[PDB]
Design an enzyme around this catalytic site. Structure first.
Site, PDB file in Angstrom:
ATOM      1  N   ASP A  38       0.831  -1.230  -0.101  1.00 40.64           N
ATOM      2  CA  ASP A  38       0.034  -0.013   0.167  1.00 40.64           C
ATOM      3  C   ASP A  38       0.531   1.279  -0.089  1.00 40.64           C
ATOM      4  O   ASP A  38       1.356   1.750   1.098  1.00 40.64           O
ATOM      5  CB  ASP A  38      -0.863  -0.080   1.447  1.00 40.64           C
ATOM      6  CG  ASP A  38      -1.796   1.227   1.354  1.00 40.64           C
ATOM      7  OD1 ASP A  38      -1.851   2.055   0.319  1.00 40.64           O
ATOM      8  OD2 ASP A  38      -2.286   1.356   2.446  1.00 40.64           O
ATOM      9  N   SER A  96      -0.472  15.550 -12.253  1.00 42.48           N
ATOM     10  CA  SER A  96      -0.977  15.153 -13.581  1.00 42.48           C
ATOM     11  C   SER A  96      -1.132  16.525 -14.441  1.00 42.48           C
ATOM     12  O   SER A  96      -1.626  17.340 -13.862  1.00 42.48           O
ATOM     13  CB  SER A  96      -2.049  14.306 -13.649  1.00 42.48           C
ATOM     14  OG  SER A  96      -2.607  13.929 -15.004  1.00 42.48           O
TER      15      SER A  96
END
Length: 330
Positions: free
Chosen positions: A35, A199
């Site tokens: 994770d 992004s």
């Protein structure tokens, strides 16, 4: 040194991925959920409330000659989905894919919430975010990666998740046969303890690319892709019959639909998520309403590049003095 381990979906939908981990001497092999959005390595154990164990493999520290109770240490964690676990702490030898760390904090669960109990395939979590998020008190502990780093050939790990198929976590090297083209690297902020990056935009299907900054986290422990409501609305508007359902808890769509792809930007590069990766199947057994793999982050407080996005790429988690993230197509 290096390590290399196969990671395998827990079910037919890729709801999560498990990776075998050797703990203790002799080895006790547990299947852990790696994770990159948390920083605790915790396991079901001989200490876990018996009624809260249902099929998981447990770590028994009394059977490990290298286990040592970390005196006075406790831990307690809550995840974004509302699940939680807590307990005490041992140090022991932990190996992943041939890479061995001695003195690793192994957090032994005394209590786990219902969703963990109900998932027989996950024996615990192995956190790979930054150690500043580790919950051990009163002395915070380091992640497996942080402990291994100095020994690694290169201070990196890579995630190569499969679509409805096994994949690979590598430590300490970049497998240049595992991706196509080049790896595009992008800046990371560690200010919130996550692999947080920005992004450069998105496209829906064969649509034009929209240049827009989307700050979010690379999180192998989250199943879906959570993005701003504007972006998510634009995606689902291209699927006839798609709608946001408050009763179901997100966007659903007719199972008869063909889903469009979703592209996200990494610098000047582009990663394409095929439409099929965005199908998470019937909302309930036999239903013709299917759950979407792209959902709104509104009210999460953060955008999350979860498995839906990451499995479309070969992803480099670069733990150099100034960390960065790399993405390649594959």
């Amino acid at each position: 040194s290096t390590g290399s381990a196969t990671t395998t979906p827990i079910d037919s939908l890729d709801d999560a991925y498990i990776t075998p981990v050797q703990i203790g001497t002799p080895a006790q092999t547990l299947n852990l959920d790696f994770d990159t959005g948390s920083s605790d390595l915790w396991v079901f154990s001989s200490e876990t409330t018996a009624s809260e164990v249902d099929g998981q493999t447990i770590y028994t520290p009394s059977k490990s000659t290298t286990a040592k109770l970390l005196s006075g240490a406790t831990w307690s964690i809550s995840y974004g989905d509302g699940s939680s676990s807590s307990g005490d702490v041992y140090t022991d030898t932990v190996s992943v894919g041939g890479l061995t760390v001695t003195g690793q904090a192994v957090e032994s669960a005394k209590k786990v919430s219902s969703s963990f109990t109900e998932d027989s395939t996950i024996d615990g979590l192995l956190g790979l975010a930054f150690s500043t998020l580790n919950t051990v008190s009163p002395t915070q502990q380091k992640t497996f990666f942080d402990n291994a780093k100095a020994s690694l050939d290169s201070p990196v790990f890579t995630a190569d998740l499969g679509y409805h198929a096994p994949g690979t976590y590598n430590f300490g090297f970049i497998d240049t046969t595992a991706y196509t083209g080049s790896i595009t690297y992008t800046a990371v902020s560690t200010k919130q303890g996550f692999w947080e990056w920005t992004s450069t935009g998105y496209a829906v299907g064969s649509g034009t690319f929209k240049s827009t900054s989307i700050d979010g986290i690379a999180d192998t422990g989250t199943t879906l892709l959570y993005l701003p409501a504007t972006v998510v609305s634009a995606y689902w508007a291209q699927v006839s019959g798609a709608k946001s359902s408050s009763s179901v808890g997100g966007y659903v769509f007719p199972c008869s639909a063909t889903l469009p792809s979703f592209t996200f930007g990494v610098g000047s590069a582009r990663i394409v998520i095929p439409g099929d990766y965005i199908d998470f199947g019937p909302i309930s057994t036999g239903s013709s309403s299917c759950f979407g793999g792209i959902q709104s982050s509104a009210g999460i407080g953060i955008n999350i590049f979860g498995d839906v996005a990451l499995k479309a790429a070969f992803v480099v988690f670069n733990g150099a003095t100034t960390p960065t993230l790399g993405f390649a197509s594959k």
